[PDB]
């Protein structure tokens, strides 16, 4: 087992705005009080983004989750 | 340590710090 250091970066200045913008694609705003609904919606949307944006095979250099989220949501990076 | 590493001007991960906030 090899541990890779990862920067989640959830408290970056735009991650909250990006997450709320992604959640805004769900039209059941009344259910946003429920963590189960929010988690399900965001998981489905992030899986859809991963299928859309991840390309077939530096290319393996990683700088945490935040650049990946920015590239998935905006197409830049 | 012994090495005095020389700076490498690289922009490979420069876009990884470009925020999406306007």
């Amino acid at each position: 087992i090899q541990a890779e250091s990862w920067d989640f970066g959830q408290f970056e200045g735009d991650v909250i705005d990006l997450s709320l913008r992604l959640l805004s694609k769900d039209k059941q705003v009344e259910k946003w009080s429920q963590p189960v609904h929010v988690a399900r919606v965001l998981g489905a949307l992030l899986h859809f983004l991963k299928e859309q944006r991840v390309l077939p095979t530096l290319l393996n250099k990683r700088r945490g989750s935040v650049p990946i989220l920015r590239q998935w949501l905006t197409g830049r990076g | 340590q012994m090495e005095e590493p020389a700076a490498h001007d690289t922009e490979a991960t420069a876009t990884d710090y470009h925020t999406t906030s306007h």
Partner: protein
């Protein structure tokens, strides 16, 4: 689980005496591989024993990880905020070739703004790199320094070390 490349095959012909256990030692050498394994792949080692016309073959498999040289980071456990801090980084070249095109990067949220990449000299086999970095921690708390080493033999070799940055004395 996607098959990347076929690296090595080996065929043996043995005779087993009745009710006798036989131990065969086989050396698994990188230089025997038909090609270098693709990056971020794992080694599937399989054994298959077939005898005469029994129509049944014994089989075993094992997943083997590829182990890269250890990136040793030396740094004090505690550090004062707004005071210079030195972290020495060492790597031993345990490969069969010199390490060329060597780039080392350091980063970490709360210690270094974005990342700073440096070039260090080529490392000949059985020699050691020993690079020292000075930076001033500026945020109080439990921080982490991440070091990444790049060369022509391996890329994105990452190690980390945690440092507790404390507030200055009143």
């Amino acid at each position: 689980g996607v098959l990347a490349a076929k690296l090595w095959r080996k065929k043996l012909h043995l005779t087993l005496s009745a009710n006798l256990e036989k131990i065969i030692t086989i050396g698994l050498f990188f230089s025997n591989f038909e090609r270098n394994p693709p990056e971020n792949t794992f080694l599937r080692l399989t054994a298959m024993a077939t005898h005469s016309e029994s129509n049944l073959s014994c089989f075993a498999q094992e997943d083997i990880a590829i182990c890269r040289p250890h990136l040793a980071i030396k740094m004090p456990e505690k550090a004062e905020q707004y005071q210079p801090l030195t972290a020495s980084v060492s790597l031993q070249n345990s490969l069969d070739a010199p390490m060329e095109d060597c780039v080392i990067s350091i980063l970490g949220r709360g210690l270094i703004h974005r990342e700073r990449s440096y070039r260090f000299r080529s490392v000949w086999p059985e020699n050691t790199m020993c690079a020292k970095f000075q930076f001033t921690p500026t945020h109080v708390g439990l921080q982490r320094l991440t070091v990444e080493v790049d060369c022509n033999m391996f890329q994105n070799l990452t190690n980390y070390k945690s440092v507790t940055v404390v507030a200055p004395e009143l």
